[PDB]
Curated annotation (Swiss-Prot):
Main location: periplasm
GO BP field: D-alanine transmembrane transport; symbiont-mediated suppression of host innate immune response
GO cellular component entries: ATP-binding cassette (ABC) transporter complex, transmembrane substrate-binding subunit-containing; outer membrane-bounded periplasmic space
Source species of the chain: Salmonella typhimurium (strain LT2 / SGSC1412 / ATCC 700720)
Record SMART domains: PBPb
Residues that bind D-alanine: G72, S74, R79, A124, E168
CDD domains xrefs: PBP2_Ala
Biological role: Part of the ABC transporter complex dalSTUV, that imports D-alanine into the cytoplasm. Helps protect the organism from oxidative killing by host neutrophils through sequestration of D-alanine, a substrate that is converted to hydrogen peroxide by the host enzyme DAO (D-amino acid oxidase). DalS shuttles D-alanine from the periplasm to the DalTUV complex situated in the inner membrane and through hydrolysis of ATP, D-alanine is transported across the membrane into the cytoplasm. Not required for the metabolism of D-alanine found in the stem peptide of peptidoglycan.
UniProt superkingdom: Bacteria
InterPro entries associated with the record: Solute-binding_3/MltF_N
Annotated protein name in UniProt: ABC transporter D-alanine-binding periplasmic protein
Consequence of gene disruption: Does not affect growth in vitro but leads to decreased growth rate in macrophages. Decreases survival in host neutrophils. Decreases virulence in a mouse infection model.
GO molecular function, one term: amino acid binding
Record keyword Ion transport present: no
Protein backbone atom coordinates (compact mmCIF):
# COMPACT_ATOMS: atom_id res chain seq x y z
CA UNK A 1 0.00 0.00 0.00
CA UNK A 2 0.99 3.61 -0.74
CA UNK A 3 -1.94 4.59 1.55
CA UNK A 4 -1.87 2.45 4.77
CA UNK A 5 -0.11 3.62 7.99
CA UNK A 6 0.40 7.17 6.79
CA UNK A 7 0.05 10.47 8.69
CA UNK A 8 -2.16 12.88 6.71
CA UNK A 9 -2.19 16.69 6.91
CA UNK A 10 -5.92 17.54 7.11
CA UNK A 11 -7.22 21.11 6.62
CA UNK A 12 -10.65 21.96 8.20
CA UNK A 13 -12.63 25.18 8.74
CA UNK A 14 -15.23 23.91 11.20
CA UNK A 15 -18.19 26.36 10.83
CA UNK A 16 -20.51 24.21 8.50
CA UNK A 17 -22.83 22.19 10.78
CA UNK A 18 -23.58 19.37 10.63
CA UNK A 19 -20.75 18.60 8.13
CA UNK A 20 -18.06 19.97 10.38
CA UNK A 21 -18.43 22.17 13.44
CA UNK A 22 -17.24 22.47 17.13
CA UNK A 23 -19.37 21.25 20.12
CA UNK A 24 -20.07 23.75 23.03
CA UNK A 25 -17.03 21.97 24.47
CA UNK A 26 -14.66 22.83 21.54
CA UNK A 27 -14.12 19.38 20.07
CA UNK A 28 -14.51 18.92 16.30
CA UNK A 29 -17.69 17.11 15.38
CA UNK A 30 -19.70 16.15 12.30
CA UNK A 31 -20.43 14.09 9.23
CA UNK A 32 -16.99 14.73 7.51
CA UNK A 33 -15.00 13.84 10.66
CA UNK A 34 -16.93 10.65 11.24
CA UNK A 35 -16.47 9.58 7.62
CA UNK A 36 -12.86 10.39 7.33
CA UNK A 37 -12.05 8.94 10.85
CA UNK A 38 -13.55 5.54 9.97
CA UNK A 39 -11.62 5.60 6.74
CA UNK A 40 -8.37 6.31 8.73
CA UNK A 41 -9.19 3.53 11.24
CA UNK A 42 -9.70 1.04 8.34
CA UNK A 43 -6.40 2.08 6.74
CA UNK A 44 -4.43 2.68 10.01
CA UNK A 45 -3.68 6.33 9.19
CA UNK A 46 -3.30 9.24 11.55
CA UNK A 47 -4.73 12.74 11.01
CA UNK A 48 -2.69 15.91 11.59
CA UNK A 49 -5.59 18.45 11.63
CA UNK A 50 -5.11 22.23 11.23
CA UNK A 51 -8.06 24.72 11.47
CA UNK A 52 -8.06 27.46 8.97
CA UNK A 53 -10.38 30.16 7.81
CA UNK A 54 -12.32 28.96 4.78
CA UNK A 55 -9.99 30.45 2.22
CA UNK A 56 -7.11 29.00 4.16
CA UNK A 57 -8.48 25.47 4.11
CA UNK A 58 -9.13 25.53 0.27
CA UNK A 59 -5.72 27.25 -0.32
CA UNK A 60 -3.91 24.52 1.72
CA UNK A 61 -5.43 21.55 -0.14
CA UNK A 62 -5.11 23.35 -3.55
CA UNK A 63 -1.31 24.00 -3.00
CA UNK A 64 -0.80 20.48 -1.60
CA UNK A 65 0.17 21.82 1.82
CA UNK A 66 -2.72 19.58 3.08
CA UNK A 67 -3.34 16.06 1.84
CA UNK A 68 -7.11 16.30 2.66
CA UNK A 69 -9.67 19.05 3.37
CA UNK A 70 -13.23 18.79 4.60
CA UNK A 71 -15.88 21.03 6.03
CA UNK A 72 -19.00 20.46 3.83
CA UNK A 73 -16.99 21.37 0.67
CA UNK A 74 -18.97 21.71 -2.57
CA UNK A 75 -17.53 19.88 -5.64
CA UNK A 76 -17.32 22.75 -8.17
CA UNK A 77 -15.75 22.84 -11.69
CA UNK A 78 -13.41 25.63 -10.61
CA UNK A 79 -12.18 23.64 -7.55
CA UNK A 80 -11.72 20.40 -9.48
CA UNK A 81 -9.00 22.09 -11.54
CA UNK A 82 -6.78 22.23 -8.44
CA UNK A 83 -8.30 19.65 -6.10
CA UNK A 84 -9.44 16.07 -6.46
CA UNK A 85 -12.73 15.12 -4.75
CA UNK A 86 -14.32 11.91 -3.47
CA UNK A 87 -17.64 10.78 -4.90
CA UNK A 88 -20.33 13.05 -3.44
CA UNK A 89 -21.80 12.04 -0.04
CA UNK A 90 -24.70 14.52 -0.25
CA UNK A 91 -26.80 16.07 -2.98
CA UNK A 92 -27.08 19.70 -1.91
CA UNK A 93 -29.47 22.66 -2.38
CA UNK A 94 -28.88 26.45 -1.97
CA UNK A 95 -31.55 28.49 -0.17
CA UNK A 96 -32.12 32.20 -0.17
CA UNK A 97 -33.12 32.92 3.45
CA UNK A 98 -34.68 35.99 5.13
CA UNK A 99 -35.83 36.72 8.63
CA UNK A 100 -39.29 35.28 9.20
CA UNK A 101 -40.80 38.79 9.79
CA UNK A 102 -39.31 40.12 6.54
CA UNK A 103 -41.81 38.93 3.94
CA UNK A 104 -39.78 38.74 0.75
CA UNK A 105 -41.86 36.95 -1.90
CA UNK A 106 -39.71 35.69 -4.76
CA UNK A 107 -41.71 34.76 -7.88
CA UNK A 108 -38.69 34.31 -10.11
CA UNK A 109 -35.05 35.42 -10.51
CA UNK A 110 -35.97 38.87 -12.02
CA UNK A 111 -36.89 39.83 -8.49
CA UNK A 112 -33.43 39.32 -6.92
CA UNK A 113 -31.77 42.70 -7.85
CA UNK A 114 -34.02 44.52 -5.37
CA UNK A 115 -32.21 42.80 -2.44
CA UNK A 116 -28.82 42.48 -0.81
CA UNK A 117 -27.53 38.92 -0.79
CA UNK A 118 -24.75 37.80 1.59
CA UNK A 119 -22.81 34.67 2.36
CA UNK A 120 -19.37 33.53 3.44
CA UNK A 121 -16.39 34.72 1.37
CA UNK A 122 -14.85 31.94 -0.80
CA UNK A 123 -18.07 29.85 -0.88
CA UNK A 124 -19.67 28.28 -3.97
CA UNK A 125 -22.58 30.73 -4.09
CA UNK A 126 -20.17 33.00 -6.06
CA UNK A 127 -19.98 30.43 -8.90
CA UNK A 128 -23.78 30.05 -9.02
CA UNK A 129 -24.07 33.83 -9.33
CA UNK A 130 -21.21 34.27 -11.86
CA UNK A 131 -22.36 31.42 -14.08
CA UNK A 132 -26.18 31.32 -13.76
CA UNK A 133 -27.48 34.64 -12.51
CA UNK A 134 -25.05 37.29 -13.76
CA UNK A 135 -25.22 36.47 -17.54
CA UNK A 136 -29.03 36.84 -17.55
CA UNK A 137 -28.86 40.03 -15.50
CA UNK A 138 -30.58 38.51 -12.39
CA UNK A 139 -27.84 39.59 -10.02
CA UNK A 140 -24.11 40.57 -10.03
CA UNK A 141 -21.18 39.53 -7.88
CA UNK A 142 -20.52 43.15 -7.20
CA UNK A 143 -23.76 43.66 -5.23
CA UNK A 144 -23.00 40.66 -2.95
CA UNK A 145 -22.01 41.05 0.76
CA UNK A 146 -19.29 38.72 1.89
CA UNK A 147 -18.65 37.52 5.43
CA UNK A 148 -16.00 35.49 7.23
CA UNK A 149 -18.44 32.73 8.26
CA UNK A 150 -22.10 31.73 8.33
CA UNK A 151 -22.28 33.25 11.86
CA UNK A 152 -21.41 36.73 10.68
CA UNK A 153 -23.72 36.47 7.65
CA UNK A 154 -26.51 35.45 10.14
CA UNK A 155 -25.66 38.42 12.51
CA UNK A 156 -26.27 40.84 9.67
CA UNK A 157 -29.45 39.01 8.62
CA UNK A 158 -30.75 39.26 12.17
CA UNK A 159 -29.99 42.95 12.69
CA UNK A 160 -31.52 43.94 9.39
CA UNK A 161 -28.41 44.99 7.44
CA UNK A 162 -28.75 41.98 4.98
CA UNK A 163 -32.00 41.08 3.15
CA UNK A 164 -31.13 37.55 2.14
CA UNK A 165 -28.53 35.06 3.18
CA UNK A 166 -27.45 32.34 0.75
CA UNK A 167 -27.36 29.21 2.86
CA UNK A 168 -26.98 25.57 1.92
CA UNK A 169 -29.69 23.26 3.02
CA UNK A 170 -28.05 21.27 5.97
CA UNK A 171 -26.71 24.53 7.45
CA UNK A 172 -30.15 26.19 7.07
CA UNK A 173 -31.90 23.33 8.93
CA UNK A 174 -29.25 23.55 11.64
CA UNK A 175 -29.93 27.28 12.11
CA UNK A 176 -33.69 26.98 11.80
CA UNK A 177 -34.50 23.67 13.51
CA UNK A 178 -31.65 23.20 15.95
CA UNK A 179 -30.56 26.70 16.86
CA UNK A 180 -34.30 27.79 16.50
CA UNK A 181 -33.45 30.99 14.59
CA UNK A 182 -36.64 32.54 13.26
CA UNK A 183 -35.53 32.45 9.56
CA UNK A 184 -37.45 31.32 6.43
CA UNK A 185 -36.24 30.23 2.92
CA UNK A 186 -37.75 32.43 0.22
CA UNK A 187 -36.31 30.60 -2.76
CA UNK A 188 -34.63 27.17 -3.18
CA UNK A 189 -32.11 26.14 -5.90
CA UNK A 190 -32.85 22.44 -5.62
CA UNK A 191 -30.09 19.73 -6.09
CA UNK A 192 -27.77 22.21 -7.64
CA UNK A 193 -24.69 21.06 -5.74
CA UNK A 194 -22.82 18.14 -4.25
CA UNK A 195 -20.62 17.82 -1.17
CA UNK A 196 -17.43 15.72 -1.15
CA UNK A 197 -14.17 15.18 0.74
CA UNK A 198 -11.29 17.15 -0.92
CA UNK A 199 -7.77 15.77 -1.59
CA UNK A 200 -4.54 17.31 -2.99
CA UNK A 201 -4.35 16.90 -6.78
CA UNK A 202 -3.12 13.47 -7.86
CA UNK A 203 -3.51 11.98 -4.35
CA UNK A 204 -4.03 8.16 -4.18
CA UNK A 205 -5.89 8.81 -0.95
CA UNK A 206 -8.85 10.16 -3.03
CA UNK A 207 -9.05 6.81 -4.94
CA UNK A 208 -8.70 4.67 -1.75
CA UNK A 209 -11.33 6.78 0.08
CA UNK A 210 -13.71 6.24 -2.86
CA UNK A 211 -12.98 2.52 -2.60
CA UNK A 212 -13.68 2.62 1.18
CA UNK A 213 -16.96 4.44 0.50
CA UNK A 214 -17.87 1.49 -1.74
CA UNK A 215 -16.64 -1.07 0.77
CA UNK A 216 -19.08 0.50 3.20
CA UNK A 217 -21.82 0.75 0.59
CA UNK A 218 -24.54 3.39 0.13
CA UNK A 219 -26.83 2.30 2.94
CA UNK A 220 -24.07 2.69 5.60
CA UNK A 221 -22.86 6.03 4.14
CA UNK A 222 -26.38 7.54 3.87
CA UNK A 223 -27.00 6.20 7.36
CA UNK A 224 -24.03 8.18 8.60
CA UNK A 225 -25.06 11.30 6.72
CA UNK A 226 -28.76 11.08 7.80
CA UNK A 227 -27.80 10.34 11.41
CA UNK A 228 -26.22 13.73 11.70
CA UNK A 229 -29.02 15.47 9.96
CA UNK A 230 -31.75 13.75 12.06
CA UNK A 231 -29.77 14.69 15.29
Amino acid sequence: SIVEGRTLNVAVSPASPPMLFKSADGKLQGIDLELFSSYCQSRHCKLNITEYAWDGMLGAVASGQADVAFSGISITDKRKKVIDFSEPYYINSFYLVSMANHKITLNNLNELNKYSIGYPRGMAYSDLIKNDLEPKGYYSLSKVKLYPTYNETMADLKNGNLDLAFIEEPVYFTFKNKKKMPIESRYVFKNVDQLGIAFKKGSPVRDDFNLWLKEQGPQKISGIVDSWMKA
